[model samples]
Target: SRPPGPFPWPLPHLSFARLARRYGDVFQIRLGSCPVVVLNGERAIRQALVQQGAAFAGRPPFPSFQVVSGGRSLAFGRYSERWKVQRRVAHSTVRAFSTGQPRSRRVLEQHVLGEARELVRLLVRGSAGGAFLDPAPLTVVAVANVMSAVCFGCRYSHDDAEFRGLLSHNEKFGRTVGAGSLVDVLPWLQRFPNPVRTAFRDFQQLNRDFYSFVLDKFLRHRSSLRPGAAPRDMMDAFIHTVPRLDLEYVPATVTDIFGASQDTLSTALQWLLILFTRYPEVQARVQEELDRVVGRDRLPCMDDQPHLPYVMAFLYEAMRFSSFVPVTIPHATTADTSIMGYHIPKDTVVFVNQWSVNHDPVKWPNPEDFNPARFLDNKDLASSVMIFSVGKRRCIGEELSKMQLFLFISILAHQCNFRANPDEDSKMDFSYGLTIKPKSFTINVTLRST
Candidate 1:
């Protein structure tokens, strides 16, 4: 699975499926001056990332990640005491909020359900304007609202100016502060007056602006703070524990939480819509299961998931097919380690060819086809595929993202059918960043019949 030239690897998005065909499960490629080792199959991925997880759990350092995350946000922070405490707080906060522990004022389900309902109504209202419309804006806002409810204790109206700008400009987060930023990877480039550095600076400013917006939320939450009162939202939870953290930790962690949650779920759901429009039979089967499990009289909820196997399967297939992040965020080796007996030196950049694992023919038969039945009746296939890698540094928002996607898919598919609009030029493209997202496209959404 080796290429002639060691640099660039000749393909984008972290692939090795062809490489897997040429070589075995594990392969190594050098990205510029950096060395990258890719884990190709589920066995190799699980063996390295899961079996010997901690050795492979460290995050690679980046200027943008450090500057953006403040060395405190768990996502990109180093594997240190700072990372540990912040990580613990983030997990506990997300869990406590979602579970509504100690009698929380509101549960996560309430916000998601409310947003889903409102989202549908908005779709219904706008369905009359034209036969076809882009679902991106509406879905993005709905998911953003869910994050707002969890983080800020409130949601916004459709025309909120600030929310609109944040969405319009930085939705392509990777373009500015993402993994592929030239200035982030190659520090020497900063001295030059290149477009890459200029773009990086602009995007860097965008993050600062976004974080300031979040910082203002923290101040506002602090201003209204009432000691000994039950915590109302994530902000209140963090506020109650201010003594345990540095002042910088508050806004930085909030930025990480709000940004990651909104993008991952929103990007995932957009992939689902693309899959729905691309695979009509698959979508029909999903709606069929939806109707059987949950009638039209009521909106779909998490509790009804067990009865809707096909719906769940289709979602899995969509995620597996799209592989939102073909290559993960590039984990670093904390110490010298051996993966499948291959020596990985300390500080070497490790990339999990997670896309290959999802598309691995060794695990998934007819890997190229968008088949849901691969997981039908047997739901454990999803367990083998690690959409969010494994071990300590695994994404904190995994559970919340799943719950949100489940509810969104269940509700939307139950209420409307997604159809692609005709275009002279047919294309389906993904924009790469911290996450790879489907490009916006028009879809004719119609009311579903009971």
Candidate 2:
């Protein structure tokens, strides 16, 4: 068979479609000194990422990630017993919040609703002053506050020095990494005289500073625990388990939690707001549902999700339409693995091309269109949505993020109506980063009248 057409580097959409067209769902492509196998359709994605999960679960050893994380973070760690333990612990921690058995959902819901109220107050104050306001930063701070509360047992006030520094550093690191410096692809480039060396050094220092902050808070919480007191947050639970696990536990573990959880959740919120702006009718429908089910007097809760199917569908569609992590963090093959009659050699770097599957014409009709109705009829669509990714190694904070999104959207819509500012272009052109985000712009949020 002829090789796939002129493939583009970095831009995954073009390359993924080329492979899927020539070689069906699963196809091989050699891009920049690496043989990457792309999974185009849902079947290929499930078979590779779900069925043969263990064989394909290991992340590729990228030089940049190695430099930043030293292979210690949960998101980039290789497949091993240590990874399993950390993943299991994190998964259990998040599930506790999702299931509402221990009232974990209540904690997250409270913060989300509170943040929404703060946002409305800010908007109202701004409107009164005739000031223009951007919701993106406010949304980021709100989502980050939720994750901070979950991970550290404490929430940051809007003006806290630590929270401000954390957000600033996160924004910087996200920009640097998402740029995909050449040093990421070429390992030897680090040895040469270049700017990436400085970038790498700066990234390391930033990582240290950020994680040190989290660790200090974590340690303080650990020392203050009462005898047999119930565990309050992720740090408390993790600290309790550290003695039992044989794997090396370092500050980087907390770093991973802070970085990954905050970025994913914050980016999702940004995208959700942008989508709402573009589709005001969809926003109106969601608000209508919320008003009917969850009155304005009360904030929406986790239990209300079942009553608000349209809200859930809109969220799912947003994830599908604009994948935050367009290309999944690459996974490597542990051993010789064969899938769909192709032999993937041991140590081969494999990436599940999530963008392709999400936009695949075969699975999604009018794949380019932003339609939430596609998910309304199919319950399986919720499970299949690759936003949180798939399989055992999927994101630990999936449910927490979902709850945050649902509650945040509900409360914000109930309290205020957002429309693109007349001075700004309403086009939905997004800038690609580690997570895709809407371009910075102002929106007029008119407070809803009772």
Candidate 3:
């Protein structure tokens, strides 16, 4: 149709909402030379990702991702035998850190609680009562420490310069990618020097530093482990499996594990805090649950989740409302696939617009409102929640993210009370970069003495 115009051009931020209203569930739009198929609504996503999933399992060839990742990263890798091996390793390793394992969950819970306490200290120092505290950086450190513990078997000091650099680099990379660089969509654009290329170099350096950090910790642990002892954490488990797998895949596969774990976990925590800021009532209710069940004497542990149904529901609802990665990392069709009576060719790029489905008016009564009650006893809604996505390519650290969210949120709520600054603007403004994050603002948190 001569390419739908006057196009949405240069407005990637509002593209998801705009397309959903205009096209209903599914629509095609031409971005430069590329034809992108956007899938909105629950049925459309289910049909493409579940019913015709195998056919649409491949990843699109984005030049920037291809150059930076070298087709080796798990999230961006094409559907292949190698990708399967990487996915298997990731899935198996992450399972060890879930709620079923007391030892692993204990380790994660400890770090989460420790970080929350540190955050409380920061809040007290900055603005004790009605003080302004930005939860983004606080949440970043909490998640990074937990992931570091999972990957390296230790956490970094809060003031470690190198550790702070990693967090900053990650934030920058997320922002750059979310900006939708021209070089990302068009390969030829890379011939000219661009800001994205600079970002790519910076990201590559960050990746190098991160892997080196992981390797150093891994070698140290290998030397220290007693003979016949079990591998301690994810890095050790991965190292144990490397020799068993094809030698060609070892280094890249290890890199994939570190990269995937850090960004996804950090982004999730950012979203969690953003929701906490927007819906004070939801936050208050969760705090009340924590107080009633776990009590203010100690932090909530993974063991307390059973007695905390509302807390779990609140976390799920926050993810649903945030819909951080509204446009999921695009998946391409490997073979000819048909959906909703439309014909698609092999290698065609398809994006499942998760934001549309999560906020669908028909499914969610008051989709825009921050209400966790919708998830109470609603098995159908719970299943449809695609925060970690679905199928073989789902998030490996999904459970870990949930554990961190619950533990951190509960601990922070129990120990401290926060209120937005009344003197500042009452309207909440959020920054949409790589992840949707709250704008730089201050909140005062006071320690609640029981």
Which candidate achieves the best TM-score against the true structure? 2
Candidate 2 lDDT over 1-450, as tens digits, reads 322332444554556777587768776665666667777777877888789888888887776566444347788888888778777886776567776565475556676676777877877677554456777777778877777877775678978987888788878787567324455556565687777677766776776666667668766876797757666776666666652343335445666766777777778878887777778999888788888998878777777888888888988888998888877778788888777777777888766778887777777878788989887855786777787778767777788777778887878777777776667776777776577788787766777755
Q: After superposition, how far is residue 432 of candidate 3 from its true place, in Å?
A: 1.2
lDDT of each: 0.73, 0.73, 0.69
Q: TM-scores of all models?
A: 0.88, 0.91, 0.89
Clash count in backbone of candidate 2: 1
Q: For candidate 1, what is the TM-score?
A: 0.88
Clashing pairs in 1: none
**Tens digit per residue, CA lDDT, model 3, 1-450:** 311222433445257558658855666776666777777767877888788777877888775455333346677788987677777886777677676476566556676777777877876678754447666666667667766666666678977886787677667656656324455566565567777666656655655565555556656866686766665666666666652345434445555655666656666666565566656887788788788898767777878977888888987887888777676777898898777777777898777777777887878877878788988865566767776666566677777777777777777777866677766676657667555665676677777664
The Cα RMSD in angstroms, rounded to one decimal, for candidate 3 relative to the true structure is 3.1
Off by over 4 Å in 1: 1-11, 97-107, 172-174, 178-180, 241-247, 422-434
Displacement of the residue 397 alpha carbon in candidate 2, Å: 1.5
- Stretches off by above 4 angstroms in model 3 are 1-13, 67-71, 175-181, 205-209, 212-218, 221-227, 242-244, 247-254, 261-264, 274-278, 378-380
Q: Which ten residues in a row have the lowest lDDT in candidate 2?
A: 1-10
